[PDB]
């Protein structure tokens, strides 16, 4: 297993870590803010997804300070890894066409 | 079984405070919310606040005089209300009750009858 | 905050009718309403989540339908032990809020 797979591996299980620790923060920090909607877990963690993936159906979001703290390193986790997939998608399609001229 | 167990009732002088009490069994979960709920003879519903007994935070009702304190004792799974200051107003039977977390109250006390009288 | 409003307050059904106890919240709350039944000198207990799904324990008799801002409750053949205090209850929006409450009368 060559390292750009494991670091792809490693990132979606960091991310995953990410998605569930964001969902039951993103709860703790918006509960007792009036107006909130992000305040059970089940929809947290729907939000969480499509915070990472950057999707932002609007149906949910954020309203409080440590809630958009929360949001913001779930984007970051989510870019950051799905960059890291495709990284890891070019180093493997540069390998294939390193040995596809002999070198 | 019997999941929150309240004390029965709470006679209190006018002024001064207590603290009542409810002991979780059954599965406790980290992300267990402990509520209470105000109820005045003959009338309705009334949520004062909720805490999270895991990680210690407590949020209130803030369109009522804010009369609560809430803690928790993570080793004996008893969550505190600590009512202060208490006037004939604050008669009223105090339900705690447990939420997952999911936005319901899936099971609740018996109560607890909290009389301020001289 | 949303306000959960019950009209009307009492409601007289002969035994055995159908009855229907309804919820109005002041804004879209979706289906995140849900139902207790509260008995004389009982405490609250818990007969329908998210608008309609069914909690076992509760008789069949008990159902729910509704969204966004109209709620229903429902009793298809009510009998005595149905009597009590019905309220509803939102989480789509902090703080939770209660309904002002209706009693079943046969």
């Known amino acids: 297993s060559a390292l750009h797979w494991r670091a792809a591996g490693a990132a979606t299980v960091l991310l995953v870590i990410v998605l569930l620790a964001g969902s039951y923060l993103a709860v703790l920090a918006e509960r007792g803010a009036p107006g909130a909607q992000l305040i059970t877990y089940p929809r947290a963690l729907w939000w969480s997804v499509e915070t990472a993936t950057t999707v932002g159906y609007g149906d949910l979001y954020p309203v409080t300070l440590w809630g958009r703290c929360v949001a913001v390193v779930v984007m970051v986790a989510g870019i950051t890894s799905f960059g890291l997939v495709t990284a890891a998608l070019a180093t493997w399609f540069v390998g294939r066409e390193q040995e596809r001229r002999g070198h | 079984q019997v999941q929150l167990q309240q004390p029965g009732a709470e006679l209190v002088k006018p002024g001064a405070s207590v603290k009542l009490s409810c002991k979780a069994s059954?599965?406790?979960?980290?992300?267990?919310?402990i509520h209470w709920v105000k109820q005045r003879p003959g009338h309705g519903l009334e949520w004062i606040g909720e805490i999270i007994p895991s990680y210690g935070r407590a949020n209130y009702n803030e369109k009522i005089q804010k009369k609560a304190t809430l803690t928790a004792d993570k080793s004996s799974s008893t969550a505190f209300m600590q009512l202060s200051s208490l006037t004939s107003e604050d008669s009223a039977v105090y339900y705690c009750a447990r939420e997952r977390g999911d936005g319901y109250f899936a099971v609740w006390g018996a109560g607890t009858t909290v009389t301020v009288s001289s | 905050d949303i306000l959960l409003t019950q009209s009307p307050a009492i409601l007289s059904v002969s035994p055995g009718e159908r009855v229907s106890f309804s919820c109005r919240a002041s804004?879209?709350?979706?289906?995140?309403i849900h139902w207790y039944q509260q008995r004389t000198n009982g405490s609250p207990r818990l007969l329908i989540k998210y608008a309609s799904e069914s909690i076992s324990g509760i008789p069949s008799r008990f159902s729910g339908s509704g969204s966004g801002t109209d709620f229903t409750l429902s009793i298809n053949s009510v009998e005595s032990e149905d009597i009590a205090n019905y309220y509803c209850?939102?989480?789509?929006?902090?703080?939770?809020?209660f309904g002002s409450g209706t009693k079943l009368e046969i």
């Open positions: 804004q879209s709350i979706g289906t995140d």
């Open positions: 209850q939102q989480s789509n929006r902090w703080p939770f809020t």
């Open positions: 059954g599965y406790t979960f980290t992300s267990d919310w």
